[PDB]
């Protein structure tokens, strides 16, 4: 039995002083990074004047020398220009020119363009950037289709021909140097004769599968031969080179997979470098995301020390000056050049991933960004790092890649008068930098060489934008960033409009903090904390108000390795469970009397304790629940977020009129054994209720630790009792007479059993006992032919197999548009086989065990049934070491119809179906027809498809162009409808109001919209003489929050929306005519239709309804036949309410949120029926970086 | 400018649909589109497909896409004023079909 | 001003939309009121003319 965490994340090598200095700078505050860069970038007054003069001369040349002329010549609108370019791109997918020209003349120019050519506009976001300079994540394909029809009908064939010629030149000659390396090499002769050199970029990155990595490898290898043949002995400075991306060469290029990277990726880079060596060409390693920087240094170090590569100085390496580590990286590289004797080619760039780095650091809750947040800081950093490089030209070859004439001029003068080819060079991008560097290369200009980065294949802050902006003077463009920064009030102040991750929510609450698993200091520290956590004698005991109770004790085992004993649980007797409820009832007034802000302070203190204890908590979750480190971080963060969110919501809402329910039974699941456990308990507690906490039988230890933390934070023992045990303990708690509410997260079937037990009881005030039940989902993702396959595959792999698919949100059914299904399926299967399954005390493990042998057996029986039916089943092979735990291999099953899947399979099992484009709407129907409605994903770039699908899908949590898991507290409030839950959403603003007898008005909870059928009904009531009911109807229309539409604060690059919709059809069980009118008003005001109990005998009370109201009203004798319903309103005395509540619990399908009132309560209390529970919350999270960048950033 | 009911036929004077009425084939006006698809149109198209009327189901879907129902634009004007232009359903359309397919096409147009 | 705006608006709307496939109706009778005797007079006539129709 391997010692827990003994091999968690050993570094590739011991971290040298120089390597540790890099890591120390990773997230250094911006105010600390900038002063030394200012000092290093400082130049004399004379040089600064000379540089400003050279930059002026360059910019004057630039401003004194395509698509815009086309737009002008044909008077195209922006949308028409974009649509035309999309048409031209599509027409260029036709290889035979005569065939294409015939199509244009005979079909396209006559308006018939859709029948002859996947949407025409899949790449419109790119063309939009080309035409307008603005980026959108998604495409208004209806606007573009209108515009294309309009422009063709107005201008005909000539505009199409001009568009085709424009797109052909742009895509074949301006975006790329060539479509093939042979073509690119042919076209490079012209500028090589004028003194430029080239570095060819075979467009390739982010391999998803082994096959894709192998394809990029052979593209690089074939290109090295072609470039080396063409180089013809010109050597590494005068002759052309190649640039590669490490992410192209291995599908798992990450720190977590460092062993595979060194074992499998490094030999491939070595092989390519050996070929570049034999031709004596440059081979540059491009720089990618910040979390790959230091890993790439390990590859660089091995390569530069590998004697097989000796005698060649062509190895190159990019460093990104927008990164806080850049000068320390340069120190390391320069030292490596000295040690190895290799003159490393160092390409200094600013950096290409800025938007993505900001978003990632915010999502991960990290201390700070790994890049600067003010552009001027990157400019100073660049100049500072150029000074370091220029002092080391004897041991490295600096390559200053920039299109910024001010940056260029500063470095040109910094370099001074002594120059020779090979001392340093500039670099620029093909089809972008030549106008600038035509003013640099050559004895008649500045006589400095420039290497053109040449792609090969088939921002208002930017210099390139500002040079073309007439409102930007040359004086502005030649401003010295070094001296501008030096003069600022706070040197290095973070950008005012970018939130640190901790401040994502501003004054509302403090964001939880994560851990950077790419940081070697963090990994080393965490390794020790994790190991220490595994030496702890974790226990869970029945913790009653009166002290710990005796009980039957059993060991808790690691699901990934049953030899690994995590702790001991003493389980609660049925008698002590019942005693716990009585003790909670006795203590309820004392806890209710603690002022809400002090109860919230308890929550906030527990959040601080959990944050401080996160490393230890991680180790327990990893071993007790079988979770990976990353998922354990997310789980502790979620628990912290729940605590702080419900604390803030309490401070926003709860007063003395919002009385507690009384003792609340919180039954939590094993799959989020800290976060959902904490969230339910924290909400009930902070609402003023004492809690009986019943954790899942599988995961009592982290529950006991959560209770220990909450008690340490000030929750009295009598307000929070821990009752470990099996379902017998849960059943005893639910059935206890003084149980005033139940919060349950778990299976739909157990929720239904709880509902049936609660249906027998009424509160002291004669109301149904509230049940908040979050249950399963049969979660689908729809992917159309406009989606980017690589993004889809990553989001599918994560959504389906993260946490072994043991997320309630996990992707269960992937729906692939037929035209792209085979390609995406091939990539998905390839990505599946790159997953590492094993015991989760290793950072390299992607997917851990399922929770128990019974879970394993249930999942495997499903897989074998599908296999027995002839369905194609793809499974990763598991290592023999998995035998000691309970593992199910991640599995892909191809289904014929969504109906082939008849039950939620709670494991790492993805089902795939294919659909024809025209059947999309029926597909959404089939998804809805499961009766579930938890999470739903849509991958598309087309606004018409987004609008269509999101308006028809019935799910609580929608995700556009991203994964469907990991809903964030207060950002994607979480919870679904139908078989997936009662609501209200956890981590949302309606949650606490369910836990008090009189619900408060939640923050921001209102709507100016009035349901029009409500209004028609109120007029009808007045027509009938029911004047008081009409007034109540109008009041309900105003009080309803139906139509609420909010954007919730979250990370950049994402839009998080929260909306209140109608629930569906409400079952009305009235007793009196006035009661019926009040119930109908409540239901209509919240957008619902109704089914009215025909046994009420009140049919004569709804004579002559307006058709608008009649359409919403059904009469039901057989309630089970007329469902599913989405809620119920009941009128009667206590016996009638009890009998109706029992009949409603017997209805098949969803657990109905029932509200009950007596006739007298309806007359007395305008809020007898609360409208919070008659709307449906919907959360939608849209990835707005999905087109590749962030528009607003 | 222009109203409904007893106030006129439309299209509005000084608006983007006006010239289309004065030609035998109307053009697509500037900015005249909508990403909204009428859900009853969609239900009708599915019904047509389940019925095997594949040409009409296709025509119905195409009507749902080309409809500009739900258009919601802000028009340029003076500061201190917001000038909005929206396309809504007209109301109840009288259908006078001669053939079953004609009826399906008219219904698709009206539902879209 | 309204007459001027009609003229320029229908002119621009024409430049944005009208092509050879948008055939005219033919002679259009434009009957205008006394309460906007230039603006509505001009608007109807300008629209009919620029759409390619002769006007009465
Ligand atoms: C030949 C060549 C090769 C390159 N190779 C790589 C590579 O391997 N990896 C890589 O990441 N980049 C690479 N780049 C750089 C990247 O692609 C951009 O071209 C470069 O950052 C643009 O900088 P600039 O000096 O041309 O223009 P500028 O307009 O001067 O600088 C723009 C840059 O400033 C930075 N920036 C913008 N806003 C902010 C902000 N709010 N806060 C902080 N910084 C900000 C960004 O880095 C942005 O790209 C390469 C560039 C060239 C020319
Ligand atoms: O925790 C469990 C499993 C079975 C069960 C039934 C009820 Cl009535 C309450 C709780 C529970």
PDB file of C-alpha atoms in Angstrom, chain A residues 652-769:
ATOM      1  CA  UNK A 652     -29.486  41.835   3.298  1.00  0.00           C
ATOM      2  CA  UNK A 653     -32.844  40.369   4.348  1.00  0.00           C
ATOM      3  CA  UNK A 654     -33.608  38.761   7.696  1.00  0.00           C
ATOM      4  CA  UNK A 655     -35.404  40.627  10.458  1.00  0.00           C
ATOM      5  CA  UNK A 656     -37.526  39.643  13.462  1.00  0.00           C
ATOM      6  CA  UNK A 657     -40.672  39.111  11.387  1.00  0.00           C
ATOM      7  CA  UNK A 658     -38.944  36.306   9.441  1.00  0.00           C
ATOM      8  CA  UNK A 659     -39.378  33.631  12.059  1.00  0.00           C
ATOM      9  CA  UNK A 660     -37.548  30.330  11.839  1.00  0.00           C
ATOM     10  CA  UNK A 661     -39.269  27.103  10.910  1.00  0.00           C
ATOM     11  CA  UNK A 662     -37.730  25.170  13.776  1.00  0.00           C
ATOM     12  CA  UNK A 663     -35.460  22.115  13.670  1.00  0.00           C
ATOM     13  CA  UNK A 664     -34.318  21.434  10.110  1.00  0.00           C
ATOM     14  CA  UNK A 665     -33.072  18.034   8.976  1.00  0.00           C
ATOM     15  CA  UNK A 666     -30.207  18.424   6.499  1.00  0.00           C
ATOM     16  CA  UNK A 667     -29.448  15.235   4.560  1.00  0.00           C
ATOM     17  CA  UNK A 668     -26.391  15.637   2.367  1.00  0.00           C
ATOM     18  CA  UNK A 669     -24.860  13.458  -0.368  1.00  0.00           C
ATOM     19  CA  UNK A 670     -21.506  11.735  -0.670  1.00  0.00           C
ATOM     20  CA  UNK A 671     -20.541  13.424  -3.940  1.00  0.00           C
ATOM     21  CA  UNK A 672     -20.150  16.907  -2.434  1.00  0.00           C
ATOM     22  CA  UNK A 673     -19.559  15.819   1.143  1.00  0.00           C
ATOM     23  CA  UNK A 674     -18.357  19.227   2.334  1.00  0.00           C
ATOM     24  CA  UNK A 675     -19.871  21.794  -0.017  1.00  0.00           C
ATOM     25  CA  UNK A 676     -23.481  20.655  -0.212  1.00  0.00           C
ATOM     26  CA  UNK A 677     -23.265  19.532   3.415  1.00  0.00           C
ATOM     27  CA  UNK A 678     -22.124  23.008   4.454  1.00  0.00           C
ATOM     28  CA  UNK A 679     -24.496  24.884   2.167  1.00  0.00           C
ATOM     29  CA  UNK A 680     -27.672  23.249   3.458  1.00  0.00           C
ATOM     30  CA  UNK A 681     -26.612  23.511   7.091  1.00  0.00           C
ATOM     31  CA  UNK A 682     -25.341  27.084   6.789  1.00  0.00           C
ATOM     32  CA  UNK A 683     -28.557  28.303   5.211  1.00  0.00           C
ATOM     33  CA  UNK A 684     -30.789  26.599   7.783  1.00  0.00           C
ATOM     34  CA  UNK A 685     -28.641  27.834  10.677  1.00  0.00           C
ATOM     35  CA  UNK A 686     -28.369  31.393   9.451  1.00  0.00           C
ATOM     36  CA  UNK A 687     -32.130  31.502   8.881  1.00  0.00           C
ATOM     37  CA  UNK A 688     -32.444  30.893  12.632  1.00  0.00           C
ATOM     38  CA  UNK A 689     -33.143  27.160  12.648  1.00  0.00           C
ATOM     39  CA  UNK A 690     -31.332  24.493  14.656  1.00  0.00           C
ATOM     40  CA  UNK A 691     -29.979  21.769  12.405  1.00  0.00           C
ATOM     41  CA  UNK A 692     -29.792  17.987  12.518  1.00  0.00           C
ATOM     42  CA  UNK A 693     -26.977  17.234  10.073  1.00  0.00           C
ATOM     43  CA  UNK A 694     -27.210  13.750   8.547  1.00  0.00           C
ATOM     44  CA  UNK A 695     -24.207  13.233   6.253  1.00  0.00           C
ATOM     45  CA  UNK A 696     -23.997  10.492   3.671  1.00  0.00           C
ATOM     46  CA  UNK A 697     -22.994   7.137   5.138  1.00  0.00           C
ATOM     47  CA  UNK A 698     -19.982   7.110   2.814  1.00  0.00           C
ATOM     48  CA  UNK A 699     -18.487  10.481   3.832  1.00  0.00           C
ATOM     49  CA  UNK A 700     -19.001  11.225   7.555  1.00  0.00           C
ATOM     50  CA  UNK A 701     -15.461  12.396   8.347  1.00  0.00           C
ATOM     51  CA  UNK A 702     -15.442  15.617   6.347  1.00  0.00           C
ATOM     52  CA  UNK A 703     -18.965  16.261   7.668  1.00  0.00           C
ATOM     53  CA  UNK A 704     -17.715  15.940  11.252  1.00  0.00           C
ATOM     54  CA  UNK A 705     -14.867  18.310  10.423  1.00  0.00           C
ATOM     55  CA  UNK A 706     -17.350  20.764   8.912  1.00  0.00           C
ATOM     56  CA  UNK A 707     -19.452  20.602  12.081  1.00  0.00           C
ATOM     57  CA  UNK A 708     -16.309  21.008  14.187  1.00  0.00           C
ATOM     58  CA  UNK A 709     -15.455  24.149  12.183  1.00  0.00           C
ATOM     59  CA  UNK A 710     -18.978  25.596  12.414  1.00  0.00           C
ATOM     60  CA  UNK A 711     -19.033  24.968  16.150  1.00  0.00           C
ATOM     61  CA  UNK A 712     -15.589  26.562  16.492  1.00  0.00           C
ATOM     62  CA  UNK A 713     -16.984  29.543  14.569  1.00  0.00           C
ATOM     63  CA  UNK A 714     -19.649  29.980  17.267  1.00  0.00           C
ATOM     64  CA  UNK A 715     -22.601  27.758  16.257  1.00  0.00           C
ATOM     65  CA  UNK A 716     -23.777  26.299  19.596  1.00  0.00           C
ATOM     66  CA  UNK A 717     -23.794  22.527  19.995  1.00  0.00           C
ATOM     67  CA  UNK A 718     -27.561  22.614  20.465  1.00  0.00           C
ATOM     68  CA  UNK A 719     -28.020  24.444  17.154  1.00  0.00           C
ATOM     69  CA  UNK A 720     -25.889  22.013  15.102  1.00  0.00           C
ATOM     70  CA  UNK A 721     -25.985  18.307  15.861  1.00  0.00           C
ATOM     71  CA  UNK A 722     -24.166  15.732  13.747  1.00  0.00           C
ATOM     72  CA  UNK A 723     -25.895  12.374  13.211  1.00  0.00           C
ATOM     73  CA  UNK A 724     -23.730  10.016  11.145  1.00  0.00           C
ATOM     74  CA  UNK A 725     -25.302   6.842   9.845  1.00  0.00           C
ATOM     75  CA  UNK A 726     -27.274   5.221   7.069  1.00  0.00           C
ATOM     76  CA  UNK A 727     -30.773   5.862   5.747  1.00  0.00           C
ATOM     77  CA  UNK A 728     -32.353   4.567   8.944  1.00  0.00           C
ATOM     78  CA  UNK A 729     -30.898   7.634  10.661  1.00  0.00           C
ATOM     79  CA  UNK A 730     -32.183   9.914   7.909  1.00  0.00           C
ATOM     80  CA  UNK A 731     -35.631   8.314   8.060  1.00  0.00           C
ATOM     81  CA  UNK A 732     -35.813   8.686  11.835  1.00  0.00           C
ATOM     82  CA  UNK A 733     -34.928  12.378  11.533  1.00  0.00           C
ATOM     83  CA  UNK A 734     -37.462  13.092   8.794  1.00  0.00           C
ATOM     84  CA  UNK A 735     -40.221  11.319  10.740  1.00  0.00           C
ATOM     85  CA  UNK A 736     -39.543  13.085  14.040  1.00  0.00           C
ATOM     86  CA  UNK A 737     -42.571  15.063  15.181  1.00  0.00           C
ATOM     87  CA  UNK A 738     -40.602  18.253  15.790  1.00  0.00           C
ATOM     88  CA  UNK A 739     -38.858  18.225  12.417  1.00  0.00           C
ATOM     89  CA  UNK A 740     -39.946  21.510  10.877  1.00  0.00           C
ATOM     90  CA  UNK A 741     -38.193  21.328   7.516  1.00  0.00           C
ATOM     91  CA  UNK A 742     -36.022  18.994   5.462  1.00  0.00           C
ATOM     92  CA  UNK A 743     -33.203  19.896   3.110  1.00  0.00           C
ATOM     93  CA  UNK A 744     -32.288  16.892   0.997  1.00  0.00           C
ATOM     94  CA  UNK A 745     -29.778  16.465  -1.796  1.00  0.00           C
ATOM     95  CA  UNK A 746     -29.634  12.970  -3.229  1.00  0.00           C
ATOM     96  CA  UNK A 747     -31.526  10.530  -5.405  1.00  0.00           C
ATOM     97  CA  UNK A 748     -34.996  11.354  -6.715  1.00  0.00           C
ATOM     98  CA  UNK A 749     -36.260   8.069  -5.278  1.00  0.00           C
ATOM     99  CA  UNK A 750     -35.185   8.873  -1.722  1.00  0.00           C
ATOM    100  CA  UNK A 751     -36.518  12.420  -2.071  1.00  0.00           C
ATOM    101  CA  UNK A 752     -39.866  10.865  -3.027  1.00  0.00           C
ATOM    102  CA  UNK A 753     -39.782   8.698   0.115  1.00  0.00           C
ATOM    103  CA  UNK A 754     -39.062  11.771   2.232  1.00  0.00           C
ATOM    104  CA  UNK A 755     -41.894  13.683   0.555  1.00  0.00           C
ATOM    105  CA  UNK A 756     -44.289  10.831   1.371  1.00  0.00           C
ATOM    106  CA  UNK A 757     -43.244  10.840   5.037  1.00  0.00           C
ATOM    107  CA  UNK A 758     -43.592  14.613   5.292  1.00  0.00           C
ATOM    108  CA  UNK A 759     -47.029  14.515   3.659  1.00  0.00           C
ATOM    109  CA  UNK A 760     -48.467  12.986   6.844  1.00  0.00           C
ATOM    110  CA  UNK A 761     -47.490  16.005   8.967  1.00  0.00           C
ATOM    111  CA  UNK A 762     -48.275  19.692   9.337  1.00  0.00           C
ATOM    112  CA  UNK A 763     -46.295  22.477  10.961  1.00  0.00           C
ATOM    113  CA  UNK A 764     -47.487  24.022  14.246  1.00  0.00           C
ATOM    114  CA  UNK A 765     -49.162  26.686  12.079  1.00  0.00           C
ATOM    115  CA  UNK A 766     -50.910  23.983  10.017  1.00  0.00           C
ATOM    116  CA  UNK A 767     -48.769  24.332   6.886  1.00  0.00           C
ATOM    117  CA  UNK A 768     -46.948  21.652   4.878  1.00  0.00           C
ATOM    118  CA  UNK A 769     -43.449  20.905   6.147  1.00  0.00           C
TER     119      UNK A 769
END
